[PDB]
UniProtKB/Swiss-Prot annotation, chain A:
GO cellular component, one term: RNA polymerase III complex
GO MF, one example: zinc ion binding
Summary of the function given for this chain in its UniProt record: DNA-dependent RNA polymerase catalyzes the transcription of DNA into RNA using the four ribonucleoside triphosphates as substrates. Common component of RNA polymerases I, II and III which synthesize ribosomal RNA precursors, mRNA precursors and many functional non-coding RNAs, and a small RNAs, such as 5S rRNA and tRNAs, respectively.
Assembly and oligomerization: Component of the RNA polymerase I (Pol I), RNA polymerase II (Pol II) and RNA polymerase III (Pol III) complexes consisting of at least 13, 12 and 17 subunits, respectively. Pol I complex consists of a ten-subunit catalytic core composed of POLR1A/RPA1, POLR1B/RPA2, POLR1C/RPAC1, POLR1D/RPAC2, POLR1H/RPA12, POLR2E/RPABC1, POLR2F/RPABC2, POLR2H/RPABC3, POLR2K/RPABC4 and POLR2L/RPABC5; a mobile stalk subunit POLR1F/RPA43 protruding from the core and additional subunits homologous to general transcription factors POLR1E/RPA49 and POLR1G/RPA34.
Name of the protein in question: DNA-directed RNA polymerases I, II, and III subunit RPABC4
Organism of derivation: Homo sapiens
From Swiss-Prot, chain E:
Record-given protein name: DNA-directed RNA polymerase I subunit RPA2
Region annotation (Fork loop 2) ranges: 471-486
Record note on quaternary structure: Component of the RNA polymerase I (Pol I) complex consisting of 13 subunits: a ten-subunit catalytic core composed of POLR1A/RPA1, POLR1B/RPA2, POLR1C/RPAC1, POLR1D/RPAC2, POLR1H/RPA12, POLR2E/RPABC1, POLR2F/RPABC2, POLR2H/RPABC3, POLR2K/RPABC4 and POLR2L/RPABC5; a mobile stalk subunit POLR1F/RPA43 protruding from the core and additional subunits homologous to general transcription factors POLR1E/RPA49 and POLR1G/RPA34. Part of Pol I pre-initiation complex (PIC), in which Pol I core assembles with RRN3 and promoter-bound UTBF and SL1/TIF-IB complex.
InterPro entries: DNA-dir_RNA_pol_su2 (IPR015712), DNA-dir_RNAP_su2_dom (IPR007120), DNA-dir_RNAP_su2_hyb_sf (IPR037033), RNA_pol_bsu_CS (IPR007121), RNA_pol_bsu_protrusion (IPR007644), RNA_pol_Rpb2_2 (IPR007642), RNA_pol_Rpb2_2_sf (IPR037034), RNA_pol_Rpb2_3 (IPR007645)
Swiss-Prot record, chain G:
UniProt entry keywords in alphabetical sequence: DNA-directed RNA polymerase, Metal-binding, Nucleus, Transcription, Zinc
Family classification: Belongs to the archaeal Rpo10/eukaryotic RPB10 RNA polymerase subunit family.
Record has Transcription as a keyword: yes
Protein name according to UniProt: DNA-directed RNA polymerases I, II, and III subunit RPABC5
Binding site for Zn(2+): 7, 10, 44-45
GO MF annotations, alphabetized: DNA binding; DNA-directed RNA polymerase activity; zinc ion binding
Job description of the protein: DNA-dependent RNA polymerase catalyzes the transcription of DNA into RNA using the four ribonucleoside triphosphates as substrates. Common component of RNA polymerases I, II and III which synthesize ribosomal RNA precursors, mRNA precursors and many functional non-coding RNAs, and a small RNAs, such as 5S rRNA and tRNAs, respectively.
Protein source organism: Homo sapiens (Human)
Localization terms from the record: Nucleus; Nucleus, Nucleolus
From Swiss-Prot, chain I:
UniProt signal peptide: none
Identification of the protein by name: DNA-directed RNA polymerase I subunit RPA1
Illness the protein is tied to: Acrofacial dysostosis, Cincinnati type: A form of acrofacial dysostosis, a group of disorders characterized by malformations of the craniofacial skeleton and, in some patients, the limbs. AFDCIN patients may also have structural cardiac defects and neurologic abnormalities including developmental delay, hypotonia, motor delay and seizures. AFDCIN inheritance is autosomal dominant. Leukodystrophy, hypomyelinating, 27: A form of hypomyelinating leukodystrophy, a group of heterogeneous disorders characterized by persistent deficit of myelin observed on brain imaging. HLD27 is an autosomal recessive form characterized by global developmental delay apparent from infancy, poor or absent speech, ataxic gait or inability to sit or walk, spasticity, and abnormal eye movements. Some patients have seizures. Brain imaging shows hypomyelinating leukodystrophy, cerebellar atrophy, and thin corpus callosum.
Taxonomic classification: Eukaryota, Metazoa, Chordata, Craniata, Vertebrata
Residue sites binding Zn(2+) 1 per the record: 61, 64, 71, 74
Record comment regarding domains: The clamps form the DNA-binding cleft. The bridging helix crosses the cleft near the catalytic site and is thought to promote polymerase translocation by acting as a ratchet that moves the DNA-RNA hybrid through the active site.
Length: 46, 245, 147, 93, 1131, 99, 66, 49, 96, 49
């Protein structure tokens, strides 16, 4: 359910929850992405 | 003295960052206000756009895209003779051409008919031909700020302004798929035109006076030649000369 | 290969449809003895034309006498002179454009208020009478090309 | 002769009516005046001059002189808000 | 030369379809990599050895109080590769550039110094100081990517083919541009009138010299020439120009009793009787003032100058004189006697000039002009900046006896070493702007626009951007054509069709394709012995034939002797041999120019050698020895270079250019059939092609760059020039093919408008999309609490229920029109989020959200790097462009049921007006379109390099022979049927396949419109902006036209009725628009009339009139009343 | 990698192999519509590694499964009585080879 | 990027010949013969293969693979 | 009249302060007359001194 | 349109203003440099005084009962204890 | 009239020169050898030896 993120340099989830650092609690390197929630969305193709 | 100057003139005062311009600047700015405003303002009911060399319009007519032909209007009290036109105009409005985005209520109040629904548009349509519902306006009805039509004409100019054919008038016609303006090619010598990126200003008169003085005083028909020496100005274009031959 | 009326170039150069009659000479026959502003293209210190020819030759090639055309290729050297000429030309154009523009803007500060009154004598704004009959009289050359 | 030839070394030449106009204004009081500022100074309306180079100088002229402008010049009757003698506007109904 | 031993002979496509496409190779490409040897090579040599010899010249400095001789000096200083401040536990304490781009931060370095605390002579201390940081040119010997292979690259997600050479300041990539300055250590003559007026009795004449040291700072000389008969020196130090006659210098230099000076400065023109008199006159007018011996004249000069030079008032009056002498005169020599002989040769030239024996060498050619590399600028800025740190530490120590605290002598070093004089700010400034806030012009004459941001919108942009000399921004407003016209000598060292036409035309050149700046210094060790163990006679020996005829032999700033008439050419030829064979410490970088004696006014005779860096040079082949050879700018003027083989004449010529393609740059070498075209078109295209929009780069996740235009389906072009492969451009192809039929089928096409089939625009013709990636940080505005971005607990108006994820951000893949929220932040201890809707009217999708971190440690994140994507498709009005400047435009779309159809059923998709090519000289389009057809038919790709097809076997003839044996009409035409009649057309039609680049918006082509709406507040005037529906502007020229036409009703209608119409009211008595206001009568017991206007000025009366006055008139009278002036309206 | 807008448009060109004469022009609007004015396909190709791959890593076909999403991974779905209406083997794109 | 579905000029289906193209490549035909055997006649369809350059077999290497 | 022994203060609706969103951006000429008033009070103080 | 401008304009007259006119025509003299207060009342005897014209709409002019949305303002003067040159006629002043 | 029966084209043959003209043009160009000598000798006024 909750928010998910991925570390950049090693690709291992990090799931920022609390008020806290922005470092991958294993992967020293630190810069983050977001992850895709399965959703529905309309998109024409003309 | 420096205080009364910084009121009067920011230049006659000691140097200070973010000077407040007094009357010596707001009347002698880098160009000077009278040179800036008092013969030319920043006006509405007009537009500006880039132009393209195309053929299918007249040497006396420019084709305007839908944006300026739809947004811009013209006022008229609805008389028993102009009924159908201004009625369909107040029907369509600002979404489809020909329309009337707003009608001026009899008291003079402007009725912005953009976001209203269809029932209110039919209501105001059958309200158009309402006679004088009051004492102070028996000579008047709702003047319909209705859109430009094919009978109309527009005015154009170029920076810098050179001569008398620098502002020539051309008839109006609608064309949906246009992002760029259009003009005759051989008429290039009327504007010292380049067509490689320069701009063009569009204008429409609110009254019949400016319209007609554009129709005849500013046209290419009876201003066909160059009065500097009395030789033609709007000849025929080269692409339509090999055909001739 | 096609004379008039066939050649579709000769129908836009001999028919007021485009260009001139040397833009179609360039193509088929020659280019012309070049000229960098009156003077024939300059020399360098030791006396070479471009670092390909002995100093002080006598072929007119050391001048600007391009011979090839635009359908067989210009040799390597003459390609340089040509560029020199193009650059000089575009510079002079741009500068004189801005100059004549500023002259227009100076002259725009001018006579304004000269209304030809109903007495048919060209007067001015302030009840002044600067003349009696425009130019000669009346004719602003509207069709005076035709009278 | 001189204006003609200075245009003529290029090839341009204005019609010999503009020349014989611009003579009988830049010199009509005997003396030979220029027009960049000197001749045009003689303008009834100091507001067209206000439009010329620097509003303040010719405002100062108007305040020190105190003339009641007859309201014919384009500058005056255009800025006041009426219709002017220019082109369309010499007459009404 | 061996580098170009492998050019392709005609391109191919074998390499687009192999099993090996895709797997990274091991040795990355050679040529492309060396395309930026100069930049990184210089910066390489800068920090590892440059501040070696560039810290051993800062003067010992600290002198504060109490008769103390503390003289603390730098022993060494170094920089270390950029690591991280100690993280919580950083796995690898290294930072790679790709990180620095994401987080919008810099790529730094570490600065260290060794100060020896000599307590009035070495007593105590060597304290290390952490000065500050410095940026690092990527892939120098100081960045972590030093020496990596491709896989180790892609794993670090940096693009495979890196070339580097830029700096990274907050994400931007700045590059230092190469400027131009005069020759290194050379006596160049000169004439100029402007010199005349500086003082009394100045002629115009004179000589000059630019002197630069190893620790590369520079100095500029000048020796005028007086009419009276004397010669002066006019130099400048620390921003002030100084005056000194020659006598003082030639006495103070060397003791060396004067008759030496006379008999030596007089070489063999003994016949003269004014020269020698002027000489003796100098020698006297220097003798009878206050001085006889060497120390005496030193005494005098010091006593005169130490007021201005600002040395310590400790030192004697001669020490300061000596200090000054070897800080601003003939620096590069580091001796005295050679300083003497340099002055000597300078003046001898100046005389033989003023008398008129030689010819005034042009100071404006390329024979006397070289180039500054970014290493020079960097190192010299650094060395200047160190001094400032020393002096600042001085005031930091003086604040002690200033605050009357304990002025300590030692053991206070640590504390007095933290002043706040760091080097971060002054370096970030130089790059952030390009400005040169400093105290020394360092030889330069300007200080701004030094490094300008390299774009990434293409690959041609880069590939040029790194190859671009320019001549200083100051020479632009000048009108003389002599600073633009290609001197006939620059053949081979500049490009003739590549100047960037526009405002900085003519100057902002680009280099050729076969020149390499020189940046490897040599050990100038044993060359003088090598000279002298041949004919060369020693410098002051007894030269066996020593008189009027003999050549000086300078050596890059060193006299070495004299040579006589027989030898000079023999010596020059021998050194030719001993360079090309590369035998004995004789670098290949060496120039051997001997200027023979003309007996006529001409170049100054001599024989000159060089080895110094920063020079242009290009290879050629020799016909004496098979090997290839390097040629310097100065010594082309005396060589015979045969271009083609057919020319080579036996006995007169010596060289042979490698391949004819040399003349042009590289970009201008990517144009096909480019000698056929006319020149201004070549130039127009070399400008155009850089503007286009193709495949920029691979890693679209590395860069958060702001604007990335991408073209979905690019294609390799069929007709190609050889050098398209040798740089493997195909990894970045730029435009997409197209079918052209050139007919006047609609009228529509003229003045470059063109029609495109609407179907083949639905089937996918060059569809586009742009990625704009805005960036936000909530630390921008300083607020209370722990504000970070999140959807608050508070129930957000549940439209933000679905459109938002809970963390406050959009979901990936959503769409935004506007009125839709960018993001939402909950500020701590507040409970309410303050949302931000989508502002820009355009609509787009969201690609991927990147949230960065604190610089090193933890940091409560703000760090949003959202990156939208927008679609852009070619609409009516956008641009196109061929490869020959024939820029078109998108006229109108025209259903495919209409367009003609050929004999074989195919349907042109782009129509092209024929009226262009008379008055375009565009023959490239014709020849290469016929080429496109021939290729796509037979199956192979055809070469397009200039200069191949002679007049003998022309292009057209050979190249239509192909269509002949293929089966179409020889002249590349073919019949065609109408599409509305159905009838055949009599006149045949010409069809081919023409490569077609899209263009970017050169300007944002959006439109503007307004009828009514919200206007300005204080002026009641329609505002502009185009984003709140702006209006029109009537400047000075439009209003002049309005004065000119003769119309008042038009003004009364537009300016009066439409712009600022406002129903105003004035009082009839006083005639003041200021006073009257509208009344509100109370209907209470107090009986008052209906609403009628009243004023305060005339409070006793009540009478008002209505006047139509503009609101700008009201603001005008407002400012008039504020500035103490009142208006009187006649009523 | 293929952004989704471009996949959406790259679909449209795909030809359905069904009968055009047995339908009606979609009544104006009504994204749902009826049976009479629609087909309805479906695509789903979640990809993973190769279970037991050798040392080679020469070609992905040995290294992978579902890495070249073709069209035979599309499958027709029925709406209402489409089953009663059509037989098997008709409703399908025309080539089962269009990458 | 990846091979487009329908040709630009005319409209043929060309979004499948790519695989068989590389096939008839390995069998070593000179491309003229390959585009013949693949059955393409009007040239405006041939320049759709004789000059396509693939950018996903060179762009996937940066995959966020797992 | 060649001097300035009089300083008329402008009206209010001619003067009034402009607004941008919710912030009250100053007018400038209001600050000019404010500075002139501060200066004339300073002159009064120095005359009393 | 149907409605037209009414007032007639013949000709403008230029003239010089003396100090006595603006001195006797003054309605209020500013004494406090403060322009606005945090409560809402602009100032007492200030440049934004109510007698000079309404502001803070719920307020009313001191001399006129007329309100804000109906206002154009009024004019007074400030006493200058010193005499400074007029910067418009200062050039002719220096010439004289 | 153009878009219905007759069309207009910048054919490449309208520009190619007949082969009889290239037997004459290549004849004269070879004559440029002794173009300078006479001009320079007439410039200096030295006999054309």
């Amino acid at each position: 359910q909750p928010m998910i993120y991925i570390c950049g340099e090693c690709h291992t989830e990090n799931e920022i929850k609390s008020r806290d650092p922005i470092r991958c609690r294993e992967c020293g390197y630190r810069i983050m992405y977001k992850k895709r929630t399965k959703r529905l969305v309309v998109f024409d193709a003309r | 003295q420096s205080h009364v100057n910084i009121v009067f003139d920011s230049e006659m005062d000691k140097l200070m960052m973010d000077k407040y311009p007094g009357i010596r600047q707001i009347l002698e700015k880098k160009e000077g206000l009278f040179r800036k405003h008092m013969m030319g303002k920043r006006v509405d009911y007009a537009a500006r756009s880039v132009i393209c060399p195309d053929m299918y319009i007249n040497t006396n007519e420019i084709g305007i895209p839908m944006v300026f032909a739809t947004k811009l209007t013209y006022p008229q009290p609805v008389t028993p003779w102009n009924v159908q036109e201004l009625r369909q105009a107040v029907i369509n409005g600002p979404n489809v051409h020909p329309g009337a985005s707003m009608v001026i209520n009899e008291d003079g109040s402007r009725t912005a008919l953009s976001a209203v629904d269809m029932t209110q548009r039919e209501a105001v349509a059958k309200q158009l031909l309402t006679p004088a519902t009051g004492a102070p306006k028996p000579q008047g009805t709702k003047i319909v700020c209705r859109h430009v039509k094919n009978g109309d004409i527009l005015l154009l100019n170029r920076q810098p302004t050179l001569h008398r054919p620098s502002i020539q008038a051309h008839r109006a016609r609608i064309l949906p798929e246009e992002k760029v303006l259009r003009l005759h090619y051989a008429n290039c010598k009327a504007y010292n035109a380049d067509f490689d990126g320069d701009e063009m200003n569009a204008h429409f008169p609110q009254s019949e006076l400016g319209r007609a003085e554009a129709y005849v005083l500013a046209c290419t028909d009876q201003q066909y030649l160059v009065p500097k020496d009395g030789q033609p100005l709007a000849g025929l274009i080269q692409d339509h000369m090999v055909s001739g031959a | 290969h096609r004379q008039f009326p066939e050649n579709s170039l000769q129908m836009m150069v001999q028919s007021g449809a485009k260009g001139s009659t040397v833009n179609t000479m360039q193509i088929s026959c020659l280019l012309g003895q070049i000229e960098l502003e009156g003077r024939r293209p300059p020399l360098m210190a030791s006396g070479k034309s471009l670092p390909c020819f002995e100093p002080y030759e006598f072929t007119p090639r050391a001048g600007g006498f391009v011979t090839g055309r635009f359908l067989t290729g210009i040799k390597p050297p003459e390609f340089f002179f040509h560029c020199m000429a193009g650059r000089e030309g575009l510079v002079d154009t741009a500068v004189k454009t801005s100059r004549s523009g500023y002259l227009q803007r100076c002259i725009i500060k001018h006579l304004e208020g000269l209304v030809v009154q109903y007495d048919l004598t060209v007067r001015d704004s302030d009840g002044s009478v600067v003349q009696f009959l425009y130019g000669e009289d009346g004719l602003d050359i509207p069709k005076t090309q035709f009278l | 002769k001189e204006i003609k030839d200075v245009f003529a070394v290029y090839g341009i030449a204005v019609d010999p009516r503009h020349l014989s106009l611009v003579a009988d204004y830049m010199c009509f009081e005997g003396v030979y005046k220029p027009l960049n500022r000197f001749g045009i100074r003689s303008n009834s309306s100091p507001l067209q001059q206000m439009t010329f180079e620097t509003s303040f100088q010719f405002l100062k002229q108007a305040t020190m002189l105190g003339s009641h402008d007859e309201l014919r010049s384009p500058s005056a009757c255009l800025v006041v808000g009426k219709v002017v003698r220019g082109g369309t506007g010499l007459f009404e109904l | 030369g061996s580098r170009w031993r492998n050019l392709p002979s005609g391109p191919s496509l074998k390499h687009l379809t192999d099993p090996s496409y895709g797997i990274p190779r091991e040795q990355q490409k050679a040529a492309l990599q060396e395309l930026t040897r100069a930049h990184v090579e210089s910066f390489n040599y800068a920090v590892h050895e440059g501040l070696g010899l560039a810290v051993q010249a800062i003067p010992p400095f600290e002198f504060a109080f109490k008769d103390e001789r503390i003289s603390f000096t730098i022993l060494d200083a170094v920089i270390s590769p950029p690591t991280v401040p100690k993280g919580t536990i950083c796995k690898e304490a290294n930072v790679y550039p790709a990180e620095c781009r994401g987080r919008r931060s810099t790529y730094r370095g570490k600065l260290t110094a060794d100060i020896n605390w000599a307590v009035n002579g070495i007593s105590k201390g060597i304290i290390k100081q952490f000065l500050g940081y410095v940026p690092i040119m990527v892939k120098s010997k100081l960045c972590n990517l030093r020496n990596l292979p491709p896989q180790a690259l892609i794993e670090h997600h940096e693009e495979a083919e890196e070339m580097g050479g830029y700096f990274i300041i907050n994400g931007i990539e700045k590059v230092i541009r190469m400027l131009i300055m005069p020759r290194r250590n050379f006596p160049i003559a000169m004439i100029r009138p402007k010199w005349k007026t500086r003082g009394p009795g100045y002629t115009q004449y004179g000589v000059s010299m630019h002197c630069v040291r190893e620790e590369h700072s520079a100095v500029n000389m000048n020796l005028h020439y007086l009419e009276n008969g004397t010669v002066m020196l006019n130099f400048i130090y620390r921003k002030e120009l100084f005056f000194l006659p020659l006598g003082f210098a030639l006495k103070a230099l060397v003791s060396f009793s004067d008759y030496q000076i006379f008999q030596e400065l007089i070489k063999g023109k003994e016949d003269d009787s004014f020269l020698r008199n002027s000489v003796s006159q100098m020698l006297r007018i220097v003798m009878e003032e206050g001085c006889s011996t060497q120390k005496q004249v030193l005494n005098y000069l010091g006593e005169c100058f130490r007021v201005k030079l600002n040395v310590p008032d400790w030192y004697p009056n001669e020490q300061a004189a000596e200090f000054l002498f070897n800080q601003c005169i003939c620096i590069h020599l580091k001796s005295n006697t050679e300083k003497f002989y340099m002055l000597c040769l300078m003046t001898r030239k100046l005389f033989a000039l003023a008398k008129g024996e030689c010819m005034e060498d042009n100071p404006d050619s390329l024979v006397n002009q070289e180039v500054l590399t970014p290493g020079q600028l960097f190192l010299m800025f650094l060395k200047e900046k160190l001094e400032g740190w020393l002096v600042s530490i001085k005031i930091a120590f003086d604040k002690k006896a200033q605050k009357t605290s304990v002025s300590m002598n030692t053991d206070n070093l640590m504390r007095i070493f933290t002043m706040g004089i760091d080097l971060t700010k002054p370096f970030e400034y130089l790059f952030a702007t390009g400005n040169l806030r400093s105290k020394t012009g360092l030889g330069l004459l300007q200080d701004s626009g030094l490094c300008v941001v390299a774009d990434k919108l293409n690959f041609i942009r880069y590939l040029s951007h790194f190859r671009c000399v320019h001549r200083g921004a100051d020479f632009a407003k000048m009108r003389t054509t002599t600073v633009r016209r290609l001197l006939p000598e620059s053949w081979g060292f500049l490009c003739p069709v590549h100047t960037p036409d526009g405002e900085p035309c003519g100057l902002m050149n680009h280099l050729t394709a076969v020149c390499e700046v020189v940046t490897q210094f040599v050990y100038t060790a044993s060359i003088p012995a090598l000279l002298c163990n041949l004919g060369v006679t020693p410098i002051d020996g007894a030269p066996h034939r020593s008189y009027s005829e003999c050549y000086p032999v300078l050596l890059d700033g060193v006299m070495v002797g004299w040579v006589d008439k027989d030898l000079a050419p023999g010596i020059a030829d021998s050194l030719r041999h001993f360079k090309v064979l590369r035998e004995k410490r004789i670098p290949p970088w060496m120039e051997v120019v001997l200027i023979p004696m003309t007996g006529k006014p001409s170049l100054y005779p001599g024989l000159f050698l060089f080895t110094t860096p920063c020079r242009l040079v290009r290879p050629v082949q020799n016909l004496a020895l098979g090997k290839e050879e390097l040629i310097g700018t100065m010594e082309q003027i005396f060589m015979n270079v045969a271009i083609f083989e057919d020319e080579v004449f036996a006995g007169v010529t010596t060289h042979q250019e490698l391949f004819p393609h040399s003349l042009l740059s590289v970009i201008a070498n990517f144009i096909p059939f480019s000698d056929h075209n006319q020149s201004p078109r070549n130039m127009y295209q070399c400008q155009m092609g850089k503007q286009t929009m193709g495949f920029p780069l691979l890693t679209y996740q590395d860069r958060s760059d702001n604007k990335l235009y991408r073209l979905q389906t690019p294609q390799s072009p069929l007709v190609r020039p050889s050098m398209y492969d040798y740089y493997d451009m195909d990894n970045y192809p730029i435009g997409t093919n197209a079918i052209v039929a050139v007919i006047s089928y609609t009228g529509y096409d003229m003045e470059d408008a063109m029609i495109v089939n609407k179907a083949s625009w639905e089937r996918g013709f060059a569809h586009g999309s742009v990625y704009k990636s805005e960036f936000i940080d909530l630390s921008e505005k300083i607020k209370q609490g722990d504000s970070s971005l999140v959807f608050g607990i508070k129930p957000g108006d549940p439209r933000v229920l679905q459109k938002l994820d809970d963390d406050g951000l959009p979901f990936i893949g959503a769409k935004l029109q506007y009125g839709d929220p960018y993001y939402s932040y909950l500020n701590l201890n507040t409970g309410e989020s303050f949302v931000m809707y989508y502002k820009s009217k355009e609509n787009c999708v969201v690609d991927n959200i990147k949230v960065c971190s604190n610089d090193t440690g933890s940091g409560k994140f703000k760090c949003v790097c959202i990156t939208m994507r927008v679609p852009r498709n070619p609409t009516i009005g956008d641009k196109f462009a061929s490869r020959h400047g024939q820029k078109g435009i998108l006229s109108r779309l025209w259903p495919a049921e209409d367009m003609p159809f050929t004999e074989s059923g195919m349907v042109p998709d782009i129509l092209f007006n024929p009226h262009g090519f008379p008055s375009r000289m565009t023959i490239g389009m014709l020849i290469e379109s016929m080429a496109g057809k021939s290729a796509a038919l037979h199956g192979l790709c055809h070469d397009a390099t200039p200069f191949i097809f002679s007049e003998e076997n022309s292009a057209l003839e050979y190249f239509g022979e192909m269509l002949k044996a293929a089966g179409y009409n020889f002249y590349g035409t073919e019949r065609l049927y109408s599409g509305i009649s159905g009838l055949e057309l009599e006149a045949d039609i010409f069809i081919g396949v023409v490569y077609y680049q899209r263009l970017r918006h050169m300007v944002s082509d959006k439109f503007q419109v307004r009828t009514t709406g919200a206007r300005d507040r204080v002026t009641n005037q329609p505002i502009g902006g185009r984003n709140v529906q702006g209006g029109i502007r009537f400047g000075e020229m439009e209003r002049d036209a309005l004065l000119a036409h003769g119309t008042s009703f038009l003004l009364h209608d537009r300016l009066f009725n439409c712009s600022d119409r406002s129903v105003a009211h004035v009082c009839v008595k006083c005639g003041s628009l200021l006073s009257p206001l509208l009344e509100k009568p109370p209907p209470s017991w107090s009986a008052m009339r209906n609403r009628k206007y009243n004023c305060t000025l005339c409070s006793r009366s009540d009478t008002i009139d209505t006047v139509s006055v503009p609101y700008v008139f009201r603001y005008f009278v407002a400012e008039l009343a504020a500035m103490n002036i009142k208006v009187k309206l006649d009523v | 990698i293929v952004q989704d807008e471009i996949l959406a448009h790259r679909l449209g060109l795909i030809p359905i192999h069904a009968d055009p004469r047995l339908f009606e022009y979609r009544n104006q609007g009504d994204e749902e519509g009826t049976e009479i004015d629609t087909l309805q396909f479906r695509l789903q190709v979640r990809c993973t590694r190769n279970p037991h791959a050798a040392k080679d890593s020469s070609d992905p076909n040995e290294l992978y499964v579902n890495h070249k999403v073709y069209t035979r991974h599309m499958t027709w779905i029925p709406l209402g009585n489409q089953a009663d209406l059509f037989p098997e083997g008709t409703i399908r794109p025309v080539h089962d080879d269009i990458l | 990027m990846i091979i487009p579905v329908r040709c630009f000029t005319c409209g043929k289906i060309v979004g499948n010949k790519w695989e068989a193209y590389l096939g008839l490549l390995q069998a070593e035909y000179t491309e003229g013969d390959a585009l013949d055997a693949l059955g393409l006649k009007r040239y405006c369809c041939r320049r759709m293969l004789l000059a396509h350059v693939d950018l996903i077999e060179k762009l996937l290497n940066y995959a966020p693979l797992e | 009249v060649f001097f300035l022994d009089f300083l008329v203060v402008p009206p209010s609706r001619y003067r009034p302060v402009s607004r941008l969103g919710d912030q009250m951006f100053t007018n400038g000429q209001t600050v000019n007359l404010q500075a002139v008033m501060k200066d004339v009070v300073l002159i009064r103080k120095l005359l009393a001194l | 349109s149907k409605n037209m401008p009414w007032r007639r304009l013949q000709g403008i007259s230029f003239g010089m203003y003396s100090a006595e006119e603006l001195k006797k025509l003054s309605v209020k003299s500013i004494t406090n440099p403060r322009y606005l207060d945090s409560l809402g009342n602009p100032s007492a005897n200030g440049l934004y005084d109510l007698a000079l014209g309404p502001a803070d709409s719920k307020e009313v002019c001191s001399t006129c009962v007329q309100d804000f949305s109906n206002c154009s303002g009024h004019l007074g003067h400030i006493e200058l204890p010193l005499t400074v040159y007029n910067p418009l006629l200062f050039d002719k002043l220096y010439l004289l | 009239y153009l878009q219905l029966y007759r069309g207009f084209t910048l054919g490449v043959e309208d520009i190619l020169v007949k082969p009889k003209a290239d037997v004459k043009r290549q004849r004269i160009i070879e004559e440029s050898t002794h173009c300078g000598p006479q001009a320079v000798r007439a410039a200096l006024n030295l006999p054309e030896a």
